[PDB]
């Protein structure tokens, strides 16, 4: 989530090969602590896994089939 924008944003935060780097990059390491605990935000699994969750989807794609059929029996 925050990590997703955080990749593209930590991207060009780097400033040349000069010691201009670490003067900001130590605080960036603090940001790395912060994101290290952002990993804790995603510490547990919800629905199983792709594609096993996708298998659940296709399972619904079979489960949708009766739904499109029994109405034909309305009369």
């Amino acid at each position: 989530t925050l990590l997703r924008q955080g990749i593209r944003q930590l991207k060009e935060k780097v400033s040349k090969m000069e010691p201009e780097e670490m003067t900001v990059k130590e605080k960036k390491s603090i940001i790395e602590i912060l994101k290290a605990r952002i990993a804790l935000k995603k510490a547990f699994l919800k629905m199983a896994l792709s594609e096993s969750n996708d298998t659940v989807v296709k399972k619904e794609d079979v489960r949708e089939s009766p739904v499109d059929t029994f109405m034909e029996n309305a009369t």
């Binding site: 199983a48 896994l49 096993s52 969750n53 298998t55 659940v56 399972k59 489960r63």
Partner: protein, 66 residues
Amino acid sequence: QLGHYIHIFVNTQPISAFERTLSSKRSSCEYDHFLLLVEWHHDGIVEHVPLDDHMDAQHLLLLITQ
């Protein structure tokens, strides 16, 4: 050759991905539960061969060791 053996039992494979994804109709929430087991041994490995009749006595002794 000097043990070297297979114990035979009963298994379970619960997994939610099939389990509650249906449930309360054509997928019982409980089973509850038991299957089959054949564990190869000696040395350092265990085959988990499929267990399905039709079957003959020779197969586990042979095919596995084949």
